[PDB]
Amino acid sequence: NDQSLRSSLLGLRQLLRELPGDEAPLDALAETVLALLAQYGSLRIAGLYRVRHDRTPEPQPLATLGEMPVLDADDLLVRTCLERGELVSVRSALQVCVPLVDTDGRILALLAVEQMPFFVFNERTFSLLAILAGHIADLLQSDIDAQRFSQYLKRSLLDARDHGLPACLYAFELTDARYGEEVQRLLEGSQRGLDVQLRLRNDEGRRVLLVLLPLTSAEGSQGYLQRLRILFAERFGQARELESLGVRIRQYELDAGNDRQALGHFLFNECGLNDQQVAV
Amino acid sequence: NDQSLRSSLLGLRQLLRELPGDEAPLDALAETVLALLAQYGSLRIAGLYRVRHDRTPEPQPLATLGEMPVLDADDLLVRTCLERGELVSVRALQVCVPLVDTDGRILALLAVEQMPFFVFNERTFSLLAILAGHIADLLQDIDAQRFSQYLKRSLLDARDHGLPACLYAFELTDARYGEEVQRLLEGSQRGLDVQLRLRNDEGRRVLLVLLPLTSAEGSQGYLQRLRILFAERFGQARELESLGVRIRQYELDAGNDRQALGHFLFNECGLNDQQVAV
Amino acid sequence: NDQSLRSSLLGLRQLLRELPGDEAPLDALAETVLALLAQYGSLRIAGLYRVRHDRTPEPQPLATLGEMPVLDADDLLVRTCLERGELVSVRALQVCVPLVDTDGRILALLAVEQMPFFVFNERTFSLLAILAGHIADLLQDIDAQRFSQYLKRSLLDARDHGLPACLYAFELTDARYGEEVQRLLEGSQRGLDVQLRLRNDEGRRVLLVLLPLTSAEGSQGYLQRLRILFAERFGQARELESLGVRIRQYELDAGNDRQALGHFLFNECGLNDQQVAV
Amino acid sequence: NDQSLRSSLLGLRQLLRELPGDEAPLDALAETVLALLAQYGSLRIAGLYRVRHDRTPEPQPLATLGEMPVLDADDLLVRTCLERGELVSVRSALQVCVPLVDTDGRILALLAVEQMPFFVFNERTFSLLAILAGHIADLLQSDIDAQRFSQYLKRSLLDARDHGLPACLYAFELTDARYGEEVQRLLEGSQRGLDVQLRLRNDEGRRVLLVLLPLTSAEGSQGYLQRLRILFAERFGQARELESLGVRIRQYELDAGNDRQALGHFLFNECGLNDQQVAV
Ligand SMILES: [Mg+2]
Ligand SMILES: [Mg+2]
Ligand SMILES: [Mg+2]
Ligand SMILES: [Mg+2]
Ligand SMILES: [Mg+2]
Ligand SMILES: [Mg+2]
Ligand SMILES: [Mg+2]
Ligand SMILES: [Mg+2]
Ligand SMILES: [Mg+2]
Ligand SMILES: [Mg+2]
Ligand SMILES: [Mg+2]
Ligand SMILES: [Mg+2]
Ligand SMILES: [Mg+2]
Ligand SMILES: [Mg+2]
Ligand SMILES: [Mg+2]
Ligand SMILES: [Mg+2]
Ligand SMILES: [Mg+2]
Ligand SMILES: [Mg+2]
Ligand SMILES: [Mg+2]
Ligand SMILES: [Mg+2]
Ligand SMILES: [Mg+2]
Ligand SMILES: [Mg+2]
Ligand SMILES: [Mg+2]
Ligand SMILES: [Mg+2]
Ligand SMILES: [Mg+2]
Ligand SMILES: [Mg+2]
Ligand SMILES: [Mg+2]
Ligand SMILES: [Mg+2]
Ligand SMILES: [Mg+2]
Ligand SMILES: [Mg+2]
Ligand SMILES: [Mg+2]
Ligand SMILES: [Mg+2]
Ligand SMILES: [Mg+2]
Ligand SMILES: [Mg+2]
Ligand SMILES: [Mg+2]
Ligand SMILES: [Mg+2]
Ligand SMILES: [Mg+2]
Ligand SMILES: [Mg+2]
Ligand SMILES: [Mg+2]
Ligand SMILES: [Mg+2]
């Protein structure tokens, strides 16, 4: 399936890591950020603007696309976007404004779109742009904590709503104290891409590894479980399966149909975790 | 300073490194590869097709976008494309973009049935072809051969598309530091950078470092990283020249005369054509 | 676990790296070289002499310890020493120790007029010769040749003196990680360790790493450093085998049969005798 | 001249840097430390012992040489050595005891010598052993501060007394504000081996670089100044000398004849520094 989004973010994540510490990342990566948003939105004319502490934009663009006019801070789209911290569209001398907002609610920057074609001017594309902008904002703010894990969860919740993209959450319960340490080792070993992991003990005292796969469909997670069973068979041979080593696999999909209510049930009732271990 | 292409390729390289080795890369990444091309061309209807060893396309698509009609392998645009190993446009389909590596093997075919008028131009065709060519390379003396293939790619990017690359040649003249300094230099490598260790005709260590999709100016980040790594090992006070490091730079751009690069590598750096192909 | 010899050589290597290139190394370090030998033999009266291209010693000493008498080049101990290229003792002088590199070129001569009875034995002669041989090397395909010279040294240390060395062969089987992992492995190199990048007969990256004056057991520090560097890049969770790294170990000791090392390099590692000499 | 001592310490310094952080350095390098002391003292029978917080030795040796007898904590040499923190000799069932003592006065370890030959049983060799033991103790305690610099100075003072080895102290005064920044850059560049450097401003407001060459004779420093003039001619050509760029070279030798009294005069009166900049 189409993993261009994860791929784009992994690539950008690598770029950020290669940055010389001299210069704010928003400034260094401005043109790249705008280009990525333009690629995802099929944008024709747009600008990328720093947003100040007072939630107003700096009108001198960090980067522009096409013949972008001077930014008008009185524009209704600009004002509604920055006041509410949400994507806004005419669906104003602009067509859509997308804020780059981190999970703490802080607006780092603003994408103002002057022109984008009718065939991408819709809630599906708007959602993609919003997801990409929020994930970029998260990356810009970055330099196994339960605290951090909870933030990644929050982002995936934001991703999942509306025309938004789902995420998958695995809970590997190590019910057999004999093969517990071993199996946990295999599991952490298998992190790849954007996987995020957290080690906990459930209410039975058993080791539980939570694995969040952001921006991952059911099809994408089925594949994840298969890479896993592959590795399992690499250390332990084909004879034995994960389930034979006392591993209980629980799965929850973050999608449009559910939200924080169902996420808590899964974690606190099905997984035997508590509100103090993971913050929903 | 727009690094989106480099960033897209870096993401792809990571997806590749971390897939199970049971599925051929083209097949596992098809939908992803088509999505990326579609973004670069604002494509609306298109298909991605495997090309066989004999420059014929398999009929059944690896991925499609929009209501893509059945591919007609006898299509004028298709045949001319696969015959030339090059992007062809109508200046039934609108554009064909082959995915061809630096050796000329066609891995796949992008068949475009519909894209908007406002992107139906050479600047856009250029981008599609560059992206296609770098994807093909990702999907495809061993070390010297690899380096020369990548060098060839950057020569294409530059002459065919006006996209820059930067080549550094580091000569290490002090045998007392050469080994260690060489390894430090190598540690400066960014994601898509490629490098080659050599001995020149004076017996000296030479490191060639190619920065694709990078201008002489935009390679200042690379150099800064390099000066940081050195300063960590030897202190911020010690100069690279005191360690016997000579630095030479060569920017790849459509501008150079066609003998310059050969002059730089063979005549200035004292290398030969069993070490690097130009 | 006594690393004093390695530490003495490391200090010498640094003195060398940081002298101005106007003075020949033997001459600038003479007093230092004699002091070190004198320590290893509890020498009381001795001289250090340059040996000419024709295996004759220059009469005037580079350095002396105690009331060293004029050197008689016709001295039985001197001639036999320089003729053999080996340490000779009286079992006018007591011991002659040549400084000879792995190619058999005699750089210098240690002439001992007096040392105590309690150190006049093979165990001591052994140490003097090992020290002398490693100093000579410091004072003296280019990379493959260098590596094979060092390999030869460690074979001498082991067979002539019962001093251990350890050889690791790392084969990188996953092309997706090979380049990066190779560089990480190379970063594990300690002061006097020597290493060589190769491609085996299956086309795979191979890193050979020699740890002189190091036992299989005492090479655990090296491995630990290696596992720390990997854990920094890939996390403490990721296994080297998951990155396609195969590790083989070969301990150099007087014990192996004389065909083992050749079997290990050529037959097990798939290398050839243009890549490594055994 | 004979730089075996500096060489030994540079080598040991490199060994310590190669150590995996897992294990106290005294424990990891014990055999090497004992071997180095044995090499410098021509020792025949000896042991290396940890010294505890209470200034008593742990009788189980970290390392031994020859047929070393059990350590007797009642031995007069052992007791006098540890009580005074100084080398002691019969010049007791032992012949000499050398404490490994850092500049803060802390005894890390003890070298007990059962047998060493008459031809090294003398104050010259005793001094060498003491210097080596103190320098090793300093290295064991290590993980441009004026505070650190002052410690290095103190060690060289300790080194210089009695049958001890001298050190040289350079003070490069940059009298010409035109070529000041440039020349200072060259000077810091030239640190090699055990050089220790400190940047200060003197009482005229001029940049002054202090350079301490530990365990360095006058002959050894003459060579240092020549490496320097060589580098100077590398950046600035042969035409101009250091002195033409406003560099005033002051020199003081730490030797047996002087001590802290003369060191202060040089620093505070000839160099125009003060007691607050460097602590003598
Ligand atoms: Mg993109
Ligand atoms: Mg107004
Ligand atoms: Mg409008
Ligand atoms: Mg619980
Ligand atoms: Mg659901
Ligand atoms: Mg770029
Ligand atoms: Mg990508
Ligand atoms: Mg396959
Ligand atoms: Mg096909
Ligand atoms: Mg499809
Ligand atoms: Mg190397
Ligand atoms: Mg590099
Ligand atoms: Mg790197
Ligand atoms: Mg570019
Ligand atoms: Mg770049
Ligand atoms: Mg950069
Ligand atoms: Mg760099
Ligand atoms: Mg720079
Ligand atoms: Mg060119
Ligand atoms: Mg070639
Ligand atoms: Mg050793
Ligand atoms: Mg030494
Ligand atoms: Mg010379
Ligand atoms: Mg001579
Ligand atoms: Mg002499
Ligand atoms: Mg490399
Ligand atoms: Mg290594
Ligand atoms: Mg290293
Ligand atoms: Mg050894
Ligand atoms: Mg060792
Ligand atoms: Mg070690
Ligand atoms: Mg290591
Ligand atoms: Mg280990
Ligand atoms: Mg052997
Ligand atoms: Mg060879
Ligand atoms: Mg020694
Ligand atoms: Mg008592
Ligand atoms: Mg006694
Ligand atoms: Mg002052
Ligand atoms: Mg004096």
PDB file of C-alpha atoms and ligand atoms in Angstrom, chain C residues 141 144-146 148 272-277, ligand 35:
ATOM      1  CA  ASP C 141      47.831  -2.574  -3.218  1.00  0.00           C
ATOM      2  CA  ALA C 144      46.958  -4.767   1.638  1.00  0.00           C
ATOM      3  CA  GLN C 145      50.739  -4.705   1.793  1.00  0.00           C
ATOM      4  CA  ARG C 146      50.713  -2.658   5.016  1.00  0.00           C
ATOM      5  CA  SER C 148      50.215  -8.114   5.662  1.00  0.00           C
ATOM      6  CA  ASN C 272      43.026 -14.661  -1.924  1.00  0.00           C
ATOM      7  CA  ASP C 273      46.790 -14.220  -1.800  1.00  0.00           C
ATOM      8  CA  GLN C 274      46.770 -10.930  -3.718  1.00  0.00           C
ATOM      9  CA  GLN C 275      44.715  -9.592  -0.787  1.00  0.00           C
ATOM     10  CA  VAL C 276      46.606 -11.035   2.131  1.00  0.00           C
ATOM     11  CA  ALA C 277      49.974 -12.732   2.493  1.00  0.00           C
TER      12      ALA C 277
HETATM   13 MG    MG E  35      49.649  -8.713  -0.171  1.00  0.00          MG
END
